[PDB]
Amino acid sequence: HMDCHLSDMLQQLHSVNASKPSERGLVRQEEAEDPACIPIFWVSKWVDYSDKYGLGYQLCDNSVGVLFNDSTRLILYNDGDSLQYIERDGTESYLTVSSHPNSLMKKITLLKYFRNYMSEHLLKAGANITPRRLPYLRTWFRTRSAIILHLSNGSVQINFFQDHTKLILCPLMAAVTYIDEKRDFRTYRLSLLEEYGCCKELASRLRYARTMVDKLLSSRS
């Protein structure tokens, strides 16, 4: 199944949700935590100017990217010079800001504007956390309750507007990282949540997640 791991994630989430992990009673949510499953990448900041320009974001490694409206993406590495350009094909090329390339000067100017805004005006998600091919934003959408961000490495991140809680779902670890209201970052193996269960708040977000992954799978291309 070649859908950037979305099918796998749907299965991991059906399985956890079907186990009804909050209904239980011997809830040992801390027993489901697995430091071996800590994500390498997540989105630390984002800026939606999608009407006209696109969606800018920062990864936790301090790389910056933009998904332009024409469906190309440009990434500036944390060195502040190396570029990675992804055309619509998915085909990738590499360049530098200092080479001053005619073909991308407009997109580079737009990316630098995004970078500056995020640096000056936004705070990092998971800033207090040392993390464990640079992925890029494959697709995204927002509901009234969340923004849903699907990375090229198959991770899905859901940022909930009401309480600033966040889910980072990693299907290759079959794991979920939950950033709670107090900015506490905790990583769970999903199969250990089936077993030890969890609080009703995490259970509810995992139910919403399932629905969001269903929505990504329902609208490919």
UniProtKB/Swiss-Prot annotation:
Q: Which domain of life is it from?
A: Eukaryota
Q: Which disease is it linked to?
A: Defects in PLK1 are associated with some cancers, such as gastric, thyroid or B-cell lymphomas. Expression is cancer increased in tumor tissues with a poor prognosis, suggesting a role in malignant transformations and carcinogenesis.
**Sequence ranges assigned to domain POLO box in this UniProt record:** 42-120, 136-218
Summary of the tissues where the protein is detected: Placenta and colon.
Naturally occurring in which organism (per UniProt): Homo sapiens
UniProt protein name = Serine/threonine-protein kinase PLK1
Q: What's the impact of mutating residue 124 to R?
A: Severe mitotic defects leading to prometaphase delay. Increased localization at kinetochores leading to increased levels of phosphorylated BUBR1
Role summary: Serine/threonine-protein kinase that performs several important functions throughout M phase of the cell cycle, including the regulation of centrosome maturation and spindle assembly, the removal of cohesins from chromosome arms, the inactivation of anaphase-promoting complex/cyclosome (APC/C) inhibitors, and the regulation of mitotic exit and cytokinesis. Polo-like kinase proteins act by binding and phosphorylating proteins that are already phosphorylated on a specific motif recognized by the POLO box domains.
List every stretch annotated Important for interaction with phosphorylated proteins: 164-166
As for PTM, the annotation reads: Ubiquitinated by the anaphase promoting complex/cyclosome (APC/C) in anaphase and following DNA damage, leading to its degradation by the proteasome. Ubiquitination is mediated via its interaction with FZR1/CDH1. Ubiquitination and subsequent degradation prevents entry into mitosis and is essential to maintain an efficient G2 DNA damage checkpoint.
